[PDB]
Design a protein around this ligand. Structure first.
Ligand SMILES: Cc1cc2nc3c(=O)[nH]c(=O)nc-3n(C[C@H](O)[C@H](O)[C@H](O)COP(=O)(O)OP(=O)(O)OC[C@H]3O[C@@H](n4cnc5c(N)ncnc54)[C@H](O)[C@@H]3O)c2cc1C
Ligand SMILES: Cc1cc2nc3c(=O)[nH]c(=O)nc-3n(C[C@H](O)[C@H](O)[C@H](O)COP(=O)(O)OP(=O)(O)OC[C@H]3O[C@@H](n4cnc5c(N)ncnc54)[C@H](O)[C@@H]3O)c2cc1C
Lengths: 287, 287
């Protein structure tokens, strides 16, 4: 019922800069993402290319960002947006068992280095999912595999382990996992998701595992899948100089809007996107 | 003789972010501008829209920028670039009695709120100039008028006063001037620069003053005049998503590249422009 002026999908520097600039402009904003902001921030050892803050690690830089947000009284909604559809003069954002409305949206979701697997596109919705928490009630007691591209997937696996019967976890990183002992860790490369009507198993380089469900856990999903109808230029959202996309009222910023992948470029684009959204909102009210 | 990899025209956040990113990438950079960085920084009372540094005045923000530059061992050349011409596979930058060469250039000069006067374009070079120091040797002992749009013009007027015979100073701001007593301050609006073959006087709303020279002192000049052959979109340089202009090896960033006029947008574009210049330089060496 309550409708936000701007919904911002992503909590890296693009989304945070967008949120601060929109709030400064008296708009009602909702900011989706992670309390950690971005795992790519957390990873960086020393950063000397963000003008005005130098010789800082990514963790120190994240803290400065967090302090700014709290000064501005901006809260991050720790929920993952699964899809966005236009409904005419607003957008409907769908999350696990929850929907929000916003007049405009800013996509600030970053990019994913890895490329999907064979069968992810075909099986999506047919045993394949990107949120294992939302789909954990389905296939309860069944056999589940989680392909974890981020450390947070481990947390989802530990919860899923209690509903499902037999859980496999495939880590896509070298850091040792912290999982309940009953979870079977498979240290192998996934190749393809098997099944015709529904997923029947997970094909790996060293073997095949029969499974009811395969959950794919990454820090983001492709914008063209998040927002059907959004025009892409290869791996990136097509944008103009004002960060406008082909969808009216939909703007983009940061890595998801193209190379170079850098923090202050992302913050600058987030500010452009926010000010374009402000202009759009104002024009919509007049007409 | 010595040729720089990148020449950056401007020392606001766009130019500074460009310089830091180019140096981080092992390029030989020259950075032109002001030790004060930008008068627009110095003016701002409180700034809460630059992600990571909050509740700061423009002077505090300028100091953080200066500290970063010194950490990176980057020096600002306090000279005003008057023109840039291509010479084939490099650019020639002309200053008062000095020239530099660079393989690529980044225009980061900001924008000027005021619009020129009648006769500025026609008389330019014929008694009209934008640097009163470079043109002070000419018309020595003659009658000079300076139209000052910035406080630094006062400093130029105090020097010019000693060569010229009779100097008028027209302030375009309300702050009281600090000038040698022999300088005649005219508190009136300039309308037009008079003359046919050469400037003959300065027409004001309340009267006309006969003069040999009219010097127009602003924080920047239009990019289309700085770099003849550069394509403009109205008041701004035409750029693409990679900050490329119509001139190969010439990039732009910040206010001069379009609205919104904001600090972190400018810093982000400066970073894009620097990384585009790095790519260009590398491609030029291979071919
Ligand atoms: C190791 C490393 C070091 C680096 N060092 C530097 C450096 O020194 N300097 C530099 O300039 N750049 C550096 N980078 C690159 C920099 O991290 C990125 O350019 C920058 O983080 C891009 O930020 P962003 O806001 O576009 O997206 P991200 O930082 O990726 O933030 C996106 C956030 O939004 C979340 N999100 C995505 N989709 C959704 C959804 N549907 N719902 C809810 N939340 C979602 C993501 O989980 C993520 O938390 C480095 C990158 C790496 C990997
Ligand atoms: C009063 C005020 C308050 C503001 N507050 C805010 C705010 O809170 N937040 C915000 O985001 N933005 C704010 N802005 C806008 C912000 O200042 C600009 O968007 C930003 O400074 C643009 O920076 P830039 O690097 O593009 O150019 P500038 O900041 O204009 O820097 C250009 C510099 O390069 C120099 N230069 C130009 N041409 C030449 C040449 N040929 N040779 C040598 N040097 C040259 C100029 O003299 C100048 O020093 C404010 C502006 C004003 C006027």
């Amino acid at each position: 019922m309550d409708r936000y002026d701007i919904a911002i999908i992503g909590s890296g520097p693009a989304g945070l800069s967008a949120a601060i600039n929109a709030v400064i402009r008296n708009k009602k904003v909702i900011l989706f993402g992670s309390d950690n902001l971005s795992n790519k921030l957390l990873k960086a050892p020393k950063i000397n290319n963000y003008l005005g803050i130098y010789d800082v690690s990514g963790k120190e830089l994240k803290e400065k960002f967090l302090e700014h947000l709290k000064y501005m009284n901006i809260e991050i909604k720790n929920e993952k947006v699964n899809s966005v559809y236009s409904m005419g003069d607003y957008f409907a954002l769908s999350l696990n068992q929850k929907m929000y409305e916003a007049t405009s949206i800013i996509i600030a979701s970053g990019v994913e280095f890895s490329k999907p697997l064979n069968g992810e596109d075909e099986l999506l919705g047919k045993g394949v999912g990107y949120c294992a928490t939302c789909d954990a009630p389905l296939y309860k007691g069944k056999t589940v595999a989680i392909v974890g591209y981020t450390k947070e997937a481990e947390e989802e696996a530990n919860y899923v382990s209690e509903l499902a019967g037999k859980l496999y976890y495939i880590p896509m990183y070298k850091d040792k996992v912290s999982l309940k002992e009953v979870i079977e860790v498979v240290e192998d490369k996934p190749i393809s998701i098997l099944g015709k009507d529904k997923v029947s198993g997970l094909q790996m380089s060293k073997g095949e595992i029969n499974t009811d469900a395969v959950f794919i856990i990454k820090d983001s999903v492709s914008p063209g899948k998040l927002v059907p109808g959004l025009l892409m230029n290869g791996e990136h959202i097509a944008v103009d100089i004002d960060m406008k996309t082909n969808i009216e009222g939909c703007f983009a910023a940061g890595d998801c809007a193209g190379r170079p992948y850098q923090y202050i470029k992302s913050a600058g684009q987030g500010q452009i996107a926010a000010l374009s959204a402000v202009s759009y909102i104002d024009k919509i009210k007049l007409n």
